[PDB]
Design a binder for this molecule. Structure first.
Ligand SMILES: [Cl-]
Ligand SMILES: [Cl-]
Length: 176
């Protein structure tokens, strides 16, 4: 029941493939973290070959950011506890996008949460990793590029009986 840390997310998050980019972990408290990625994120925002950009945003209470290109960009802000808590990312992400050169009028925000939230701090990483895999599939990634075990656990069970944490451990060991 410890929380996922950066390296845990890095290991288990889906990886960029083709028109889907998955960025490295962002730390919303460290101004340097946002500053350091503007150029990479701007490059992807304005690259015709990229259509989707995912960002895991922490630390601590991990959340997911999913940008879909069209004029306006769809920006889904996912909070494992439920959609209301995703409000904490609105300004953060809008400012990140404005730094990249996207005005706020071109951004369609929506807040989301999971079907089966647990509402405990320790599993936010697990939810965000598994939800990111679910998005990977939704965005049309090929069968090998996402982890069906995590998607199907999340979708049907959430982290009831800590089963999502068990799949994240097991899938991790497989990767190691
Ligand atoms: Cl879900
Ligand atoms: Cl906790």
């Amino acid at each position: 029941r410890d929380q996922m840390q950066d390296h845990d997310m890095t290991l288990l998050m889906p990886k960029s493939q083709g028109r889907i980019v998955v960025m490295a972990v962002l730390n919303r408290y460290d101004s340097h973290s946002a500053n350091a990625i503007i150029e990479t994120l701007a490059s992807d925002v304005f690259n015709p070959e990229v259509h989707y950009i995912m960002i895991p945003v922490g630390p601590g209470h991990w959340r997911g950011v999913y940008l879909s290109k069209p004029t306006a960009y769809d920006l889904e802000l996912f909070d494992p506890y439920g959609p209301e808590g995703a409000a904490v990312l609105d300004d953060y992400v809008l400012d990140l996008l404005n730094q990249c050169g996207v005005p706020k009028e071109l951004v369609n925000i929506r807040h989301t949460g999971p079907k089966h939230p647990q509402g405990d701090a320790y599993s936010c990483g697990d939810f965000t990793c598994a939800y990111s895999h679910k998005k990977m599939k939704e965005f049309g990634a090929p069968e090998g590029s996402y982890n069906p075990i995590l998607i199907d656990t999340l979708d049907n069970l959430g982290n009831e009986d800590n089963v999502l944490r068990m799949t994240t451990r097991e899938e991790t060991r497989a990767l190691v």
